[PDB]
Amino acid sequence: AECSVDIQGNDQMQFNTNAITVDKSCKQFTVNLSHPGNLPKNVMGHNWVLSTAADMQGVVTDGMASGLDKDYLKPDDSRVIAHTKLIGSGEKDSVTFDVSKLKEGEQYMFFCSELCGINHALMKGTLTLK
Numbered sequence: 001a002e003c004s005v006d007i008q009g010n011d012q013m014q015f016n017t018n019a020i021t022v023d024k025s026c027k028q029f030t031v032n033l034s035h036p037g038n039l040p041k042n043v044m045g046h047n048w049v050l051s052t053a054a055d056m057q058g059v060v061t062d063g064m065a066s067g068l069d070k071d072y073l074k075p076d077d078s079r080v081i082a083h084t085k086l087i088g089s090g091e092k093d094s095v096t097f098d099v100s101k102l103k104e105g106e107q108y109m110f111f112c113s114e115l116c117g118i119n120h121a122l123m124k125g126t127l128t129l130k
């Protein structure tokens with residue numbers, strides 16, 4: 001209605017939006033992730049992870065160290081503002097976070113941290129508080 005957004009990650013390593021706006025009147029904001037298509041989480045798995053644009057490379061690098069068993073994310077990574085679980089086709093996950101964790105004027109990025117293929121890296125977008 002205003003404080004949530006529906007995002008799909010499909011079999012072609014596509015997200016359906018590459019830019020999310022959070023309205024500052026929202027106390028909390030919700031991302032409902034799903035995965036169109038047929039491919040399971042081991043071959044074409046996606047999640048949804050939110051960090052500042054600045055923190056993303058570090059999140060990715062450490063996440064990579066943490067590896068597959070952790071969905072390539074450092075557990076409890078203080079730089080991840082919010083994240084979903086990993087999903088494969090026919091699966092769904094929602095995550096709610098406090099809008100107070102954002103500020104205006106900052107650049108946020110959302111992305112799939114799960115290595116899922118040739119266009120895995122394009123499964124990203126911006127998020128902005130307004």
Ligand SMILES: [Cu+2]
Nearest residue numbers: 045046112116
């Ligand atoms: Cu993915």
Ligand SMILES: [Cu+2]
Nearest residue numbers: 112114116120
């Ligand atoms: Cu991926």
